[PDB]
């Protein structure tokens, strides 16, 4: 194994490496870290920041599953998942950045009790709409006919979001409110190259449970 990925089995920011690796065909090992009793390796591999994900490619350690991303795409450029426009890739830039501001409301979220869940919820929704009418549009993907970095970083709305809902007893993500944004989430989930790679419904749903 020329390429080692250094995971956490429940955590988005290690499944959008296993989805970009996957959409690139590209052969690796994975290593499950137990984030309580780190190894040496992860130490060792990032030290700056000494947490999943991390890809190791001849030895040389990648840290922080965006920077990943973009080092998957520059170094297997088939299967293209940024495209050749400037202006364009600047939108896909500026997508993933949003989710900054999306993790921020997706944290406050899963944090939430009380009339602090509905008011988060009720931002998060805000946060939603704005991906919705101004990130996707009409477009079946963020990448137009086919799955790009943008929305391998947004991939998490659909699996992840849901067992959190579930979790929450409130549903942000639903179909009346946001339809192009729930179809796309559905749509995104039901694909091979994701739902083959993300924990089962239960594992997904007793996990976010516990950590709350």
């Not at 997706?106 to 509905?118: Q, T, V």
């Not at 989930?189 to 994701?194: A, F, G, H, N, S």
């Amino acid at each position: 194994a020329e390429v080692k990925l250094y995971g956490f089995w429940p955590s988005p920011f290690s499944h959008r490496i296993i989805w970009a690796l996957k959409l690139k065909g590209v052969e690796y090992e994975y290593i499950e870290e137990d984030l309580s009793n780190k190894s040496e390796s992860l130490l060792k591999y990032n030290p700056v920041y000494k947490k999943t994900p991390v890809l190791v490619h001849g030895d040389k350690p990648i840290a922080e599953s965006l920077v990943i991303l973009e080092y998957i795409e520059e170094t297997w450029p088939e299967n293209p998942l940024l495209p050749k426009d400037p202006y364009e890739r600047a939108m896909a830039r500026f997508w993933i950045q949003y989710g900054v501001d999306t993790v921020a409301a997706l944290r406050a979220f899963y944090l939430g009790s009380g009339e602090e869940l509905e008011k988060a919820a009720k931002e998060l929704s805000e946060c939603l709409k704005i991906l919705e009418e101004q990130g996707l549009g009409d477009k079946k993907f963020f990448g137009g006919e086919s799955m790009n970095l943008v929305d391998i970083s947004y991939g998490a709305l659909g699996y992840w979001l849901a067992a959190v809902e579930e979790a929450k007893g409130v549903t942000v993500l639903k179909p009346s409110t946001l339809p192009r944004l729930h179809a796309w989430a559905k749509n995104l989930d039901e694909l091979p190259v994701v739902k083959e790679n993300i924990p089962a419904s239960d594992k997904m749903l007793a996990y976010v449970t516990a950590a709350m």
